[PDB]
Amino acid sequence: GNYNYLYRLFRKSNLKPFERDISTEIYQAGSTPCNGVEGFNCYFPLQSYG
């Protein structure tokens, strides 16, 4: 499995045309704020292709 190609899975808003987002900030998907640390309702925004 080639896991070098990634894609963004979570983002607070949709990209404008020809916009490039490479930030790896932990996505806050719940009410509890994330302090940059992965966990419950706190996602790493990039997922790896199979």
Partner: protein, 43 residues
């Protein structure tokens, strides 16, 4: 006045356009620059 910084956080976490005009050389970069707490250029 010799330059401009454009971005969202200006703290090396995102890409920020940096334009500097030093004497006769216009320099444009879009690197993820690590800027000082109070950016300035000395003489």
């Amino acid at each position: 006045i010799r330059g401009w910084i454009f971005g969202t956080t200006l703290d090396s976490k995102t890409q920020s356009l940096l334009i500097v005009n030093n004497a006769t050389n216009v320099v444009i970069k879009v690197c993820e620059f690590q800027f000082c707490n109070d950016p300035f250029l000395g003489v």
